[PDB]
Amino acid sequence: PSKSAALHIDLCKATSPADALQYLLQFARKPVEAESVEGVVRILLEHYYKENDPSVRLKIASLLGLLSKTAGFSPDCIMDDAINILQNEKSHQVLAQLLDTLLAIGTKLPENQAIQMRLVDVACKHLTDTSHGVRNKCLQLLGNLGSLEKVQKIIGDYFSDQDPRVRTAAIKAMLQLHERGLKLHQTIYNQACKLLSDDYEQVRSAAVQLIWVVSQLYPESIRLVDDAFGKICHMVSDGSWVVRVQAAKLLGSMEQVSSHFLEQTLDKGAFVHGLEDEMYEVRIAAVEALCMLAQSSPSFAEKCLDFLVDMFNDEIEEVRLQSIHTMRKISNNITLREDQLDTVLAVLEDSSRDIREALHELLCCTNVSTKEGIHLALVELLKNLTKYPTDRDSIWKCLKFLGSRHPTLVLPLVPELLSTHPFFDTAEPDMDDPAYIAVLVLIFNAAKTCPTMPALFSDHTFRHYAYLRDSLSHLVPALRLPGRKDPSQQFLQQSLERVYSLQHLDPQGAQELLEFTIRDLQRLGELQSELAGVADFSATYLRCQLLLIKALQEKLWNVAAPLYLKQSDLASAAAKQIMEETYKMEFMYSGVENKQVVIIHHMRLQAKALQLIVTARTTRGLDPLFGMCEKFLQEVDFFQRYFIADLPHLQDSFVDKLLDLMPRLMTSKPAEVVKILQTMLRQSAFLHLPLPEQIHKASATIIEPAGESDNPLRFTSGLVVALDVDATLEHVQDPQNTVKVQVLYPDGQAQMIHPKPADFRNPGPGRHRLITQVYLSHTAWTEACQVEVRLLLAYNEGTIPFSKPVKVYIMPKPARR
């Protein structure tokens, strides 16, 4: 159809460089065929194959390869491409088109034997061009077409051909052969070790990889991995930097080496030159290499220790961060005799927030064997506290782990660190000073094992231990001091069963039971935390049922339609609340499956029925009521279509016997339809909801700004201020496309700020950290007012709130002149 029309238009136009190129470009850029008829269009591609102007033929066969990439065709396209290669071998452009089509066909889908990867490979090998016409690309053709698990000789004699580009493609073919296994041989080591001095770039950066792969294959040459690793270390000293990156990384792919030659790298020389040359690429590659070869080698590690302490002044935050990582990975049975001063003064920086938290992670996993090191580390970290009162929780964690790691070294510090004057009474220190708390949490984390430490405190120190144990139980551990020596699941099931069974009541009794169970479910959700989500889910469902029943018994359906009290209506808005609640079920709650989805979709259908009947009672225009009846019937059609299943499992519901009277609902006056919908909602049965096993409710806590700050944010009229928001998200699926921020100005106008996926963190499996900047501007105010900030959850066409409001003071001023 469309392909035939395009072929007919191309044949009718038949312009050489004008119609063919533009038509092929339009065919590629417009859409994909996505059908088997594209293979028939390949026959159309065979129709224009016999033509001049080979650029058009190259574009056509490129389109043929693109069509083969859609897996529409199979062996017929392969046979046609083989015929075209064997017949239309005309210069480099058509060679490129044919080999690209062959490469696309070989990896299209099958990748199998029986003239699918063997005959094509034989045709590619038998058609080697005389100068660069197919050579590099037929080598990658014979790469991706493995013959059998036994053909390496043709690659082997092509290590010494003319073009360095063909050398690189032979290398990449050798790569893809190794990635399929194929049991590589030993002479590749010889052809590779003669391939280092190619006197040109872009081959050595992969020749080092070939040395690595044929070295870790098996170490048997005369000793094999030592000579190969020495060659790699020689390639570390190359002038070009890309080959240095490749050499350091591909020695970082190694895992076995002789020990003595590994200490030979630093004295008599690779790592003594492998660091201080280039940007973060070479340095990070080399230090990841020393990470792995300090992990593999239990020895040597003092040498990598003092080759990491020198490189603190590299003026790159990435180098600092990954350097903190590269010594926190190797911090096992390693002490710091003299190299601890620089690593504790490296914290001294203006903000360095990621660097600072990495340094606190380093300090809690390090090992040290001296006392004055503890003294200097403590005084420097207290100076950090007095300079940045921001990260007291992080330092409490690292001091806790520092005390837990080694308790013994800090025993003489306690007579010196705190006021323990022998005869003068020690005054009670400030409890709310959040710096004495850190040294206490050190002391009592180091007091768990050593017995000679309770005798060294004072009475106020035991009362401080009492309050720290009762307040921060996750910081100080329980000691042996003489001073300080499911029903919910069954209840939820019983309550849910009592709701489900007790449905044959007077509507007053049903309302009373529903209200009591709502209050019970909120109280249970507030008390519990493991079963809070399921309690809130059941509470939302029963709230929907409660509002539906309460709207069903209304005085609106006791008088006639003209005698309508507009203001006294209570059933009009109830449809909107239950609609918003159905949105709340299907987008707030994390772990849901198709049964919850079908039940809340059915509740949405009941909601739309309530909205339809109240609008039918309000208005008198025949065309709007007829139209809304038609939209409601097609919504019911959509519901039975998308949910064609699960009707046998859900019994005697509103929608089941709705579809029982479905053709009469097609042929009736809309007034008859709306009265039978009233009668339909009156004995519409209450469904049972099987609760999911694991459910969690999504919510947000905006941790900064807190909103209790009395100081205003002050700026100039018509200009913008950026306030940083940090909030914690828990149990939110796909925050990038869903979570947004909303700013309510005190004048009424709102702003819906979309966040960046980069600014979303993932601090674990279940909690996320949103850190963005909010942009505000107005036209001057007479006093600093309260701007509202709230996180919203969006869904597909709607937004519903899920975060606690926060408020900020804003002061826009005019210019001074």
Partner 1 sequence: MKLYCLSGHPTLPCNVLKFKSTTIMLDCGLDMTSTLNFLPLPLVQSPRLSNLPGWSLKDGNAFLDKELKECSGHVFVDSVPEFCLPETELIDLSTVDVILISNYHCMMALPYITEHTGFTGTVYATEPTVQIGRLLMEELVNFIERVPKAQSASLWKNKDIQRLLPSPLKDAVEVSTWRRCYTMQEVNSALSKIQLVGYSQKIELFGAVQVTPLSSGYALGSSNWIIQSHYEKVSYVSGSSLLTTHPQPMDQASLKNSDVLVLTGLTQIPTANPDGMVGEFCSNLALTVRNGGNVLVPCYPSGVIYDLLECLYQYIDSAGLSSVPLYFISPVANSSLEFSQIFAEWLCHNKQSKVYLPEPPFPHAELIQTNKLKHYPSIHGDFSNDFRQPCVVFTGHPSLRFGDVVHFMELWGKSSLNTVIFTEPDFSYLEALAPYQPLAMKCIYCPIDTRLNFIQVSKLLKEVQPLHVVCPEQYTQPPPAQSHRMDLMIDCQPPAMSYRRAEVLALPFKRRYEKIEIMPELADSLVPMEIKPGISLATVSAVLHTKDNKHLLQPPKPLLSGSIPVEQFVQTLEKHGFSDIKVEDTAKGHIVLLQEAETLIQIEEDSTHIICDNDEMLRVRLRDLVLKFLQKF
Q: Which residues bind partner 1 (CB under 8 A)?
A: 17, 21-22, 25, 28-30, 55, 58-59, 62, 96, 100, 131-132, 162-165, 199-200, 202, 281, 715-716, 718-722, 749, 751, 753-756, 758, 773, 775-777, 815, 817
Using CB atoms within 10 Å of the CB of residue 132, give its burial: 0 to 12 exposed, 13 to 18 middle, 19+ buried.
Answer: middle
User: Which of residues 168 and 596 has its CB atom nearest to partner 1 in the complex?
Assistant: 168
The least distance separating partner 1 from the CB of residue 134, rounded to whole angstroms, comes to 12
The least distance separating partner 1 from the CB of residue 719, rounded to whole angstroms, comes to 5
Instruction: Tell me how many helices (H) and strands (E) the chain has.
Output: 36, 10
- On whether the CB atoms of residues 665 and 673 are closer than 8 A, the answer is yes
User: Which of residues 383 and 813 has its CB atom nearest to partner 1 in the complex?
Assistant: 813
Go through the chain and list every residue after which a break occurs, taking a C to next N gap over 2.5 angstroms, comma-separated: 150, 222, 268, 485, 796
Fill in the amino acid letter for 68. S
User: Which of residues 169 and 677 has its CB atom nearest to partner 1 in the complex?
Assistant: 169
Residue 316 in 3-state DSSP? Answer: coil
The least distance separating partner 1 from the CB of residue 95, rounded to whole angstroms, comes to 12
Q: HSE-up of 454 (CA within 13 Å, CB side)?
A: 10
> 């035991």: which residue's tokens?
462
What is the distance, to the nearest Å, from the Cα of residue 85 to the centroid of all Cα atoms in its chain?
46
Q: What are the backbone angles phi and psi of residue 420, rounded to the nearest 5°? A: -130, 50
Q: Pick the closest to residue 100 from 85, 88, 115, 86 (CA basis).
A: 85
Q: How far apart are CA 131 and CA 137, in angstroms?
A: 12
Peptide bond into 692 cis (omega under 30): no
Structure tokens at 225: 């991995």
User: Which of residues 280 and 638 has its CB atom nearest to partner 1 in the complex?
Assistant: 280
User: Which of residues 17 and 298 has its CB atom nearest to partner 1 in the complex?
Assistant: 17
Q: Pick the closest to residue 545 from 458, 469, 654 (CA basis).
A: 654
User: Which of residues 169 and 521 has its CB atom nearest to partner 1 in the complex?
Assistant: 169
DSSP state for residue 811 in the 8-state scheme: E
User: Which of residues 60 and 381 has its CB atom nearest to partner 1 in the complex?
Assistant: 60
User: Which of residues 17 and 412 has its CB atom nearest to partner 1 in the complex?
Assistant: 17
Structure tokens at 806: 């926060």
DSSP state for residue 187 in the 8-state scheme: H
Residue 810 in 3-state DSSP? Answer: strand
The least distance separating partner 1 from the CB of residue 792, rounded to whole angstroms, comes to 15
User: Which of residues 164 and 429 has its CB atom nearest to partner 1 in the complex?
Assistant: 164
Cα-based angle 727, 732, 735 (whole degrees, multiple of 5): 70
Fill in the amino acid letter for 720. V
The least distance separating partner 1 from the CB of residue 163, rounded to whole angstroms, comes to 7
Region of 766 on the Ramachandran plot (φ > 0 left; ψ -120 to 50 alpha; else beta): left
User: Which of residues 100 and 226 has its CB atom nearest to partner 1 in the complex?
Assistant: 100
- On whether the CB atoms of residues 118 and 145 are closer than 8 A, the answer is yes
DSSP state for residue 118 in the 8-state scheme: S
The least distance separating partner 1 from the CB of residue 778, rounded to whole angstroms, comes to 9
Q: How far apart are CA 329 and CA 628, in angstroms?
A: 66
Fill in the amino acid letter for 641. R
Q: How far apart are CA 814 and CA 718, in angstroms?
A: 9
The least distance separating partner 1 from the CB of residue 162, rounded to whole angstroms, comes to 5
Q: Which are the contacts of 761, defined by CB distance < 8 A and separation ≥ 6?
A: 768, 769, 770, 771
- On whether the CB atoms of residues 243 and 233 are closer than 8 A, the answer is no
User: Which of residues 21 and 549 has its CB atom nearest to partner 1 in the complex?
Assistant: 21
Note the helical H segments in 406-485: 414-417, 436-446, 459-471
The least distance separating partner 1 from the CB of residue 645, rounded to whole angstroms, comes to 31
> 């520092």: which residue's tokens?
402
DSSP state for residue 754 in the 8-state scheme: P
User: Which of residues 258 and 751 has its CB atom nearest to partner 1 in the complex?
Assistant: 751
User: Which of residues 296 and 777 has its CB atom nearest to partner 1 in the complex?
Assistant: 777
Using CB atoms within 10 Å of the CB of residue 469, give its burial: 0 to 12 exposed, 13 to 18 middle, 19+ buried.
Answer: middle
| Paired sense of beta strands 798-801 and 785-795, if any | antiparallel
The least distance separating partner 1 from the CB of residue 715, rounded to whole angstroms, comes to 4
Structure tokens at 145: 């077409």
Fill in the amino acid letter for 683. Q
User: Which of residues 160 and 256 has its CB atom nearest to partner 1 in the complex?
Assistant: 160
Q: Which are the contacts of 296, defined by CB distance < 8 A and separation ≥ 6?
A: 255, 256
The least distance separating partner 1 from the CB of residue 231, rounded to whole angstroms, comes to 22
The least distance separating partner 1 from the CB of residue 160, rounded to whole angstroms, comes to 9
**Length of the chain, please?**
817
User: Which of residues 45 and 254 has its CB atom nearest to partner 1 in the complex?
Assistant: 45
The least distance separating partner 1 from the CB of residue 751, rounded to whole angstroms, comes to 5
User: Which of residues 205 and 323 has its CB atom nearest to partner 1 in the complex?
Assistant: 205
Q: How far apart are CA 517 and CA 610, in angstroms?
A: 24
The least distance separating partner 1 from the CB of residue 817, rounded to whole angstroms, comes to 6
- On whether the CB atoms of residues 364 and 402 are closer than 8 A, the answer is yes
Structure tokens at 257: 């080496």
User: Which of residues 403 and 812 has its CB atom nearest to partner 1 in the complex?
Assistant: 812
Q: Which strand (E) or helix (H) includes residue 742? A: strand 739-744
The least distance separating partner 1 from the CB of residue 104, rounded to whole angstroms, comes to 11
User: Which of residues 17 and 627 has its CB atom nearest to partner 1 in the complex?
Assistant: 17
Q: How far apart are CA 523 and CA 532, in angstroms?
A: 10
The least distance separating partner 1 from the CB of residue 714, rounded to whole angstroms, comes to 8
